Design a protein around this ligand. Structure first.
Ligand SMILES: [Mg+2]
Ligand SMILES: [Mg+2]
Lengths: 189, 143, 72, 61
RNA sequence: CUCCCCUGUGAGGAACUACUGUCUUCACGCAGAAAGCGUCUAGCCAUGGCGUUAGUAUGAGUGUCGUGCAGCCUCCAGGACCCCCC
RNA sequence: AACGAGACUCUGGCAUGCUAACUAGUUACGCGACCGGUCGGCGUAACUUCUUAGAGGGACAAGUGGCGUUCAGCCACCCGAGAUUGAGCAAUAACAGGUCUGUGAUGCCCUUAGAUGUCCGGGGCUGCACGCGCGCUACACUGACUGGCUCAGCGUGUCCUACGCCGGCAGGCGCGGGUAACCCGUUGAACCCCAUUCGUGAUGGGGAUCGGGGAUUGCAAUUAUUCCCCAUGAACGAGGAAUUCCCAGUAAGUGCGGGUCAUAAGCUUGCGUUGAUUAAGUCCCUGCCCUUUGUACACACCGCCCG
């Protein structure tokens, strides 16, 4: 059997939306043991649609300068974050990644129109892959800004921001920036 | 874990005010003439444990650490651990602390000012003495 | 605002560490140090004592990041 | 109301800087209604878009 | 023009203490808004950023008191249904 | 039809088929050790999978299926080491680009014995109220420290340096090998990985500026050449208007070699290692290209020309 980080179970999780069912990974096959597969998903267009979602959260956690090249910092941090999550909510920690992706992603977003220096935005709507990507961005950035100096472990602070991104609370930096995007979308229309 | 009843929140050593809720070596470091390194030497010499916060120490440990730091060469504090190795006038090995450090600075300025040398002219006009390139940098603090 | 935390424990705070923390679900040294206004080393060594007492389950330990769960 | 949408064809890319994709929308309610729509990020045919304002139409940037 | 499957909070019960999960009240730290008022920037101009309103108005959660909210039975309703209209 | 583009050369990826190797190893068998194995420990036969490097194969949009005047070619999939390897060379033309300072490559001018010559001894290119520029290092919790565990490649060398012994550290002494797949060197490089100490404050983050000492190089170090021990421990709280470089073993982190070099890399030139976010699109901006078009310009808009 295939068990994530040795203690989890991937095949029992669920997806409630049709748009994010075709993109978000780790359901049927793609489920692996460890996040780092060192594969090439940027090789061709939408070939990064199929890589494991946990690896996807993993790749984006190196995103600031000193942490850049070090990938393992993440498969460390993503390790303790899941094991924290299961203690709080008490559900499959890979259900919490699904719900945070689904809720944190924008829906409608604004595209800047005008001349440089004058921002006048018009509302368009997000593509599924773009939804996933922006969502995960928001998750990692929310975790960083929240964890800079509170002296929180990023394990603790990402479990925080993830569970909060899943529940729908305004605690998550993620849900915040989403809510701003949708609201500007409302402003314009 | 512990709950010390007698704890000195403000400490006084060698004319200076020491913060003891800090760790021990890094509280001793606060005074002039001591870094983390020489602090580890003196506190490994006095037998004082490094696990204690600086406020749990009895007066005997503070007085034996003081006694260790006033008299360097008696306690087998290595000759290369001393701040001023051979001083210009007496020719002696001495570990220089706050007021003595500041004073030795003032004096080694005055000597070079009376002598009429280049180190001292440099130190006089407010220039960096090491021959640094003063074209580009060496600005801040100036009008 | 400037932050004061307890370097060594107080009786008041000790009642909180002793009687409360075992009910907390997820326990992290930063979580304990945030709600009890304890300092880092003292809270860390506090959980090191709550290890020896047997009141707390240790899930995993990596370098500076530790994970603790309430007993049953 | 919240709605769902299907991608029938990809037409061109609208944008100043070439940002938006201009795509064609079927409704997943089995209705035959056909509306052009602006979408951001990558789109390939067959995908489903969630519309918060479902009666809106596409304009050229 | 209906009837009867599931959703609600309108009335009666057991339960309510023991069961579990949510809203009350107090200590706790964390994110944290705007009407506006000013400023800066788009040649001129805010529909924007940034200051001040204020770390206010707030909301998510942990531990105290509730004799609560409940979950189990009925209807009164509301919606899927049908019909019907096409 | 011809040059330019491509082709080509140089580099990386494929070969359990071939040609072979005591100056590279492997398998096998002995001896050696400590509890059948573990060992860069010591020697003999066995061969090329490893390690090299030659020969030649291999990829041609090839195979299948879609979009295409079913035409080029464009997309998806399989079969596969590879369905995008990175650099060099670069036409007809031109610039009134940089080059008397790289040339025993020069046309003029000046200098030519108190020389604009040359050598000798010192100073100066390094100076400091200021602007503008590359680049280093940081602003800490994905972090600093302290111990522990195992990793590279390109090159350099008559100077690289094996092992001892004295040296807290830099360093001395010595005794050795190599013109190098032989000796440095199983090149035990840095992150990273595992434990430890630190606990949001100018803090152990940051280390400038200094005051003393030891050691090297050199004739010669003061104007700190560098290196090393203690102290001194300042700016710095993620950087305003603007803007730079970049699409896959890539950005970025991290050390390492070659150049300069008696002693020297905050520079350059290479080299591996850990290794992504996002796009496979558009002329908005910037930049040049064509096409149409107007012209009283052709020394070509720095043009022409009217009072
Ligand atoms: Mg243009
Ligand atoms: Mg003419």
């Amino acid at each position: 059997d295939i068990k994530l980080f040795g203690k989890w179970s991937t095949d029992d999780v669920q997806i409630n939306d049709i748009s994010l069912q075709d993109y978000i990974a780790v359901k049927e096959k793609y489920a692996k043991y460890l996040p780092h597969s060192a594969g090439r998903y940027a090789a061709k267009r939408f070939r990064k649609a199929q890589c494991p979602i946990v690896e996807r959260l993993t790749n984006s956690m190196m995103m600031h300068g000193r942490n850049n090249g070090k990938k393992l910092m993440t498969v460390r941090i993503v390790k303790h974050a899941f094991e924290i999550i299961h203690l709080l909510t008490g559900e499959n920690p890979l259900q919490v990644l699904v719900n945070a992706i689904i809720n944190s992603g924008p829906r409608e977003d604004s595209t800047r129109i005008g001349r440089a220096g004058t921002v006048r935005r018009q509302a368009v709507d997000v593509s599924p892959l773009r939804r996933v990507n922006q969502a995960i961005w928001l998750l990692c950035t929310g975790a960083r800004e929240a964890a800079f100096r509170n002296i929180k472990t990023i394990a603790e602070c990402l479990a925080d921001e993830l569970i909060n991104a899943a529940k729908g609370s305004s605690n998550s930096y993620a849900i915040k920036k989403k809510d701003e995007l949708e609201r500007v979308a409302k402003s314009n229309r | 874990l512990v709950i010390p009843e007698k704890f000195q929140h403000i400490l006084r050593v060698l004319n200076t005010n020491i913060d003891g809720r800090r760790k021990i070596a890094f509280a001793i470091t606060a005074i002039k003439g001591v870094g983390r390194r020489y602090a580890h030497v003196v506190l490994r010499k006095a037998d004082i444990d490094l696990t204690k916060r600086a406020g749990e120490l009895t007066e005997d440990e503070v007085e034996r650490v003081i006694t260790i730091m006033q008299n360097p060469r008696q306690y087998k504090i290595p000759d290369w651990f001393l701040n001023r190795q051979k001083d210009v006038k007496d020719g002696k090995y001495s570990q220089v602390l706050a007021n003595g450090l500041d004073n030795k600075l003032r004096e080694d300025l005055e000597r070079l000012k009376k002598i009429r040398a280049h180190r001292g002219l440099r130190h006089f006009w407010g220039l960096r003495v090491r021959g640094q390139h003063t074209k580009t940098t060496g600005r801040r603090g100036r009008t | 605002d400037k932050l004061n935390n307890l370097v060594l424990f107080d009786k008041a705070t000790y009642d909180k560490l002793c009687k409360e923390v075992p009910n907390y679900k997820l326990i992290t040294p930063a979580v304990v140090s945030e709600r009890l206004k304890i300092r880092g080393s003292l809270a860390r060594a506090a959980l090191q004592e709550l290890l020896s007492k047997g009141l707390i389950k240790l899930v995993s330990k990596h370098r500076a990041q530790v994970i603790y769960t309430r007993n049953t | 109301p919240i709605k769902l949408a299907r991608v029938t064809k990809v037409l061109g890319r609208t944008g100043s800087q070439g940002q938006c994709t201009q795509v064609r929308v079927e409704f997943m309610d089995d209705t035959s209604r056909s509306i052009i729509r602006n979408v951001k990020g990558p789109v390939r045919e067959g995908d489903v878009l969630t519309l918060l304002e479902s009666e809106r139409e596409a304009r050229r940037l």
